[PDB]
Amino acid sequence: EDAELLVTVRGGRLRGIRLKTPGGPVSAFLGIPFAEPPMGPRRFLPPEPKQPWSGVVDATTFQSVCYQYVDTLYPGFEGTEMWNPNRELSEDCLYLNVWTPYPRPTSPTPVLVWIYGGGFYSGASSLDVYDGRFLVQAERTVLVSMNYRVGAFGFLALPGSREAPGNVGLLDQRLALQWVQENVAAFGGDPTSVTLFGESAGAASVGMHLLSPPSRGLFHRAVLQSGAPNGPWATVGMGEARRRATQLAHLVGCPNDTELVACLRTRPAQVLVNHEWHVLPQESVFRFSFVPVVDGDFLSDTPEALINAGDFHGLQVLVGVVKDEGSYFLVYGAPGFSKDNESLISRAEFLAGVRVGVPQVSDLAAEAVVLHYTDWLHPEDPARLREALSDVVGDHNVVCPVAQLAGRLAAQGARVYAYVFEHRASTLSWPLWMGVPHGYEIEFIFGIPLDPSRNYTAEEKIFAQRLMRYWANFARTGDPNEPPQWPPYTAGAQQYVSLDLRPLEVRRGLRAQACAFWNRFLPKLLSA
Amino acid sequence: EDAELLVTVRGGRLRGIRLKTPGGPVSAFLGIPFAEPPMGPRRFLPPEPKQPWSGVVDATTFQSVCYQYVDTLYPGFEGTEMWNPNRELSEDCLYLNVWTPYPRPTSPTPVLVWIYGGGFYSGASSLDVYDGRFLVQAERTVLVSMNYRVGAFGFLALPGSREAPGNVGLLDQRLALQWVQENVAAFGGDPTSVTLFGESAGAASVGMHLLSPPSRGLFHRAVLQSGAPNGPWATVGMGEARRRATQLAHLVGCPNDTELVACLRTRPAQVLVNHEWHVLPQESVFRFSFVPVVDGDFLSDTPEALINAGDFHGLQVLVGVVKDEGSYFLVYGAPGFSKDNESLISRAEFLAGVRVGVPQVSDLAAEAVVLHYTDWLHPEDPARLREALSDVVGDHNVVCPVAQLAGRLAAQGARVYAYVFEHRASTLSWPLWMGVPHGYEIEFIFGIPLDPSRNYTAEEKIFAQRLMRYWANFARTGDPNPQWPPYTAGAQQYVSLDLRPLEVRRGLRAQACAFWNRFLPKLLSA
Numbered sequence A: 001e002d003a004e005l006l007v008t009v010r011g012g013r014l015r016g017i018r019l020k021t022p023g024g025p026v027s028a029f030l031g032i033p034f035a036e037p038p039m040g041p042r043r044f045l046p047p048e049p050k051q052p053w054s055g056v057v058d059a060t061t062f063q064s065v066c067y068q069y070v071d072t073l074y075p076g077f078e079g080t081e082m083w084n085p086n087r088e089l090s091e092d093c094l095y096l097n098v099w100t101p102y103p104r105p106t107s108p109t110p111v112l113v114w115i116y117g118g119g120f121y122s123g124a125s126s127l128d129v130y131d132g133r134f135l136v137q138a139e140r141t142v143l144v145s146m147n148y149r150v151g152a153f154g155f156l157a158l159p160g161s162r163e164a165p166g167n168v169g170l171l172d173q174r175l176a177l178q179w180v181q182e183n184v185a186a187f188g189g190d191p192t193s194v195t196l197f198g199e200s201a202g203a204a205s206v207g208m209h210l211l212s213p214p215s216r217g218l219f220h221r222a223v224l225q226s227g228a229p230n231g232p233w234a235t236v237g238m239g240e241a242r243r244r245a246t247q248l249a250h251l252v253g254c255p256n257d258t259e260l261v262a263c264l265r266t267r268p269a270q271v272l273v274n275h276e277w278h279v280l281p282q283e284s285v286f287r288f289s290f291v292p293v294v295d296g297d298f299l300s301d302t303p304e305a306l307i308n309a310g311d312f313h314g315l316q317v318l319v320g321v322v323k324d325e326g327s328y329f330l331v332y333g334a335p336g337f338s339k340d341n342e343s344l345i346s347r348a349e350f351l352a353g354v355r356v357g358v359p360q361v362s363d364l365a366a367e368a369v370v371l372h373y374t375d376w377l378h379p380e381d382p383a384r385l386r387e388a389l390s391d392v393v394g395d396h397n398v399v400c401p402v403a404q405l406a407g408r409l410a411a412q413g414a415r416v417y418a419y420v421f422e423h424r425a426s427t428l429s430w431p432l433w434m435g436v437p438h439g440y441e442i443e444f445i446f447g448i449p450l451d452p453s454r455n456y457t458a459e460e461k462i463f464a465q466r467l468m469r470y471w472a473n474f475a476r477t478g479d480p481n482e483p484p485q486w487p488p489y490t491a492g493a494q495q496y497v498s499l500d501l502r503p504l505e506v507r508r509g510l511r512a513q514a515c516a517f518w519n520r521f522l523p524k525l526l527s528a
Numbered sequence B: 001e002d003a004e005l006l007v008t009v010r011g012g013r014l015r016g017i018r019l020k021t022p023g024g025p026v027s028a029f030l031g032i033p034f035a036e037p038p039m040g041p042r043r044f045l046p047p048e049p050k051q052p053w054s055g056v057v058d059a060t061t062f063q064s065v066c067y068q069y070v071d072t073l074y075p076g077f078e079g080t081e082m083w084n085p086n087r088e089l090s091e092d093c094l095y096l097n098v099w100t101p102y103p104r105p106t107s108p109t110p111v112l113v114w115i116y117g118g119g120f121y122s123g124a125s126s127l128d129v130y131d132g133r134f135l136v137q138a139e140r141t142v143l144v145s146m147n148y149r150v151g152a153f154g155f156l157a158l159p160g161s162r163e164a165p166g167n168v169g170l171l172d173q174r175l176a177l178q179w180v181q182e183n184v185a186a187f188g189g190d191p192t193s194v195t196l197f198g199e200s201a202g203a204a205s206v207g208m209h210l211l212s213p214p215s216r217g218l219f220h221r222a223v224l225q226s227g228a229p230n231g232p233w234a235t236v237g238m239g240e241a242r243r244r245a246t247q248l249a250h251l252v253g254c255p256n257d258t259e260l261v262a263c264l265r266t267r268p269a270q271v272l273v274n275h276e277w278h279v280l281p282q283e284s285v286f287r288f289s290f291v292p293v294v295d296g297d298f299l300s301d302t303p304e305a306l307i308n309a310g311d312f313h314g315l316q317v318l319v320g321v322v323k324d325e326g327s328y329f330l331v332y333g334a335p336g337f338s339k340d341n342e343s344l345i346s347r348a349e350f351l352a353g354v355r356v357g358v359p360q361v362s363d364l365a366a367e368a369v370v371l372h373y374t375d376w377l378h379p380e381d382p383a384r385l386r387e388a389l390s391d392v393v394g395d396h397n398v399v400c401p402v403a404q405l406a407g408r409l410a411a412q413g414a415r416v417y418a419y420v421f422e423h424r425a426s427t428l429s430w431p432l433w434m435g436v437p438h439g440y441e442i443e444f445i446f447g448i449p450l451d452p453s454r455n456y457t458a459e460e461k462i463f464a465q466r467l468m469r470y471w472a473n474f475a476r477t478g479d480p481n482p483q484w485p486p487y488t489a490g491a492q493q494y495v496s497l498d499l500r501p502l503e504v505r506r507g508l509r510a511q512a513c514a515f516w517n518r519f520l521p522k523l524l525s526a
């Protein structure tokens, strides 16, 4: 037996596996339990640490995915299946993974912690596209990813109740981050240089760990990719959380908060998932039923409030977006859209879709959106209309939330780096009109193009290697630049770089004209 | 006696004068009385027609300027003095002018009727820059201009009262237009082809005649230059009109409407003028105390409602703006501005000026303006800020009202032509940063460059002749015609007027004017 694949952590002994890379061998420890299974009476409760075990836990394959809705819109389509669970669903799912160089490192090695996205209703650390092996081998880091509860199992909140307090999925993450502090050295990781990185809801979660003091001592640097804690989708108010938890109970035959959660706990997990989307107040895209709740505990104020009031000196942050953040979401409810035609919508469809992409606002607010995103020299051009609705959804949900976070953090002491990821993968199966859709920079950051079994080009492999260098430099030093150069983002100059097969190009403003509308004006209108 | 300079109109006999022009003689009848002098007990009342006279009235010079404020911000500066009165002030001012070719045409000739602007508080047909002689001698048309009462004397309104009903300045205009129908033939004019054209408030008045049926049988075609009846400055509501009338009264020592107007009539005209600007509710630019009031009589609804609801089939309209409508207005009250330095304002000054240029709106509305006119990659560039405040003032007060007027008329049956005038006159004395300011296309329409005594270039003279042809072509055919296409709500085509040939372009500040015409009203109701 290979001693490099035996590790003792505080709970007990683990047996790992050796994995091949086009470069060298990597050690992987998959399916390490870090919490007690949140089953039965423990559904909806904060995670409790994993009791220690005798014998040797076999950490040789991915454990199960937390219960979640499965995309069925395009059965068999690679563009959606790559995000669907690739292991059995279980509520017994709070496991984490460690990838480390082979043999295990000598000296403390810098640690990357990955938090997956998926709108807080979906995701898993087992997905192919989050494979740690390439970053570990190429950039000599230790990489940890964790599963955390999603949907109602992670974020159903009856605020004030002991029985369903909310944010427990967030607490899953924190527990994993605590686990990393106490055990990562056993694998050669340096617990004093831990960098959090995530995408979609994972980037929102990274941000929430920045703004929650108990989490803030658990890591040192942050990367937020196409997501932010201040997005209109990433948090919910106490009342709406209570209304949504309550409508779910009604939809599954339930039933006193205690009597209500008690009844929810007797229902099969899959039953809750089947009614997940029906709790939403409105037909929408880019809105999700059970997300983090602002109740004064995990988040003492709204993420936007906490950003504006924070002393962020001594923090380095890497943030960015892809070119076409909003595109794919349109085929999940915007009238006239499809992945299978050109989606050249009519003006009436555009106006309809504006209410789907910016839900729950006054008619005045909708008109203000229609005003900003219309070219009044071409009010009915279908191609321009498709592009504008994509820009509405992308600006409203990702780009302008991210721009606000970056600018406020920068103006309040943080060193910020910003990127726009502008390369469309040669392997992409979504239509060409979707551009670079939300999420399709992750495969390059994780180095997936280096897999020979996959058919990327020679330039994409080099591109992936550049990206891994940028991210790893940021982890080690707080600066993505190699020790043409990538400048910090400031509230004034608003400089960012474009990542593609061409060399770095520095540009100004993350959609500054649009994001003035969403960040500066539209809040004021909504208060009157 | 010269038989060409005697005309008989329904009131009596008139004696004219023969005028020299660079291109030949022109007959001019200047100072024809068309109403009884609105003096004494007739201050504030509708004009009453001139009663006929025996003998021969000498219509040989411009009559008096109606009582108005005189600009003193830059004493002696031609840029302001050229608009100030060039005759004595009097309430005895209701005279009009007729220019006609020499000898008088023997076939009926199409008529252009000019209404001057000046914010409804100032102006005169006497001004050099409205000299009719050049248009007449070049395009063989008959040109008429009239004086109309301005300020309180033309537009002070206590709505509902017979003693100060308001809009009497407009009725002065209407009376002159009635005069044109009964008498223009006596000079060779054709009362069946009359084209109204005006600028600033004169353009807004042209529009109000389109939207009031009694005026609408008195002309056939319309030209609106840098002004429109739907502009935020061109009308006022009944209540606000009454509030300003009443404050003006209080400020000059006057306590019953008939007793209030009675007391106002005992005040010297100059006393009224001195207190004109004090009734304005707010510090502002591009706002004027006494303007047309929407009271259901002359205007049965607001100019927007009447436009949006009107069937305009069979109407031809020529409309347009200058390049920099808003620029000069800023040195009259916007913080940091001067005609004498570059006025490279600070952002703090910019934000202040937005409240002066967009007066009487909610803080929310003010913010909506700041959003659309800030470049958020250069939020504090002084030059960009200067250019942006100019655009705020010009777009809100002129460009977008005219564009709204143009598009709605086109979409409901009218043939519309639109222009942007982009030539800065060689003679201009306003600073270079103001561009082509509001009003500095008029001299080219009237052909003033043909005056040899004035130092225009040979290219400006050719340019002036080209413009006069366009306007006169529009007057005779309804079509100014490289070809100048109709303005429509979809394609929104307009032409650029400068020393280069016609260039067709799209949209009268379409992105900005969607804000002012489509969105901002909705925001102001909630």
Ligand SMILES: *[C@@H]1O[C@H](CO[C@@H]2O[C@@H](C)[C@@H](O)[C@@H](O)[C@@H]2O)[C@@H](O[C@@H]2O[C@H](CO)[C@@H](O)[C@H](O)[C@H]2NC(C)=O)[C@H](O)[C@H]1NC(C)=O
Pocket: B334, B335, B336, B337, B338, B340, B341, B342, B343, B344
């Ligand atoms: C441009 O000038 C304005 C106006 O100042 C007037 O005109 C100048 C040419 C000069 O004659 C000044 O003395 C005049 O007062 C300047 O704005 C003024 O700033 C002063 C501060 O000293 C202030 O008291 C005034 O209220 C301001 N005037 C207005 C109308 O707001 C402006 O600073 C000058 N711009 C420059 C120098 O770049």
Ligand SMILES: *[C@@H]1O[C@H](CO[C@@H]2O[C@@H](C)[C@@H](O)[C@@H](O)[C@@H]2O)[C@@H](O)[C@H](O)[C@H]1NC(C)=O
Pocket: A335, A336, A337, A338, A340, A341, A342, A343, A344
């Ligand atoms: C594009 O597709 C939209 C969705 O229609 C669905 O998908 C297409 C491919 C067809 O199979 C259709 O029958 C399905 O219901 C349409 O609503 C939209 O009109 C289409 N746009 C076009 C054809 O230009």
Ligand SMILES: Nc1c2c(nc3ccccc13)CCCC2
Pocket: A071, A079, A080, A083, A117, A118, A119, A199, A200, A328, A437, A438, A439, A440
């Ligand atoms: N780009 C993404 C898509 C889906 N889920 C995702 C989850 C996380 C990050 C990107 C994603 C499901 C629908 C297909 C697109």
Ligand SMILES: Nc1c2c(nc3ccccc13)CCCC2
Pocket: B071, B079, B080, B083, B117, B118, B119, B123, B199, B200, B328, B437, B438, B439, B440
């Ligand atoms: N441009 C104009 C100015 C004034 N009056 C005007 C009147 C009509 C048209 C343009 C004008 C008086 C102030 C100086 C500028």
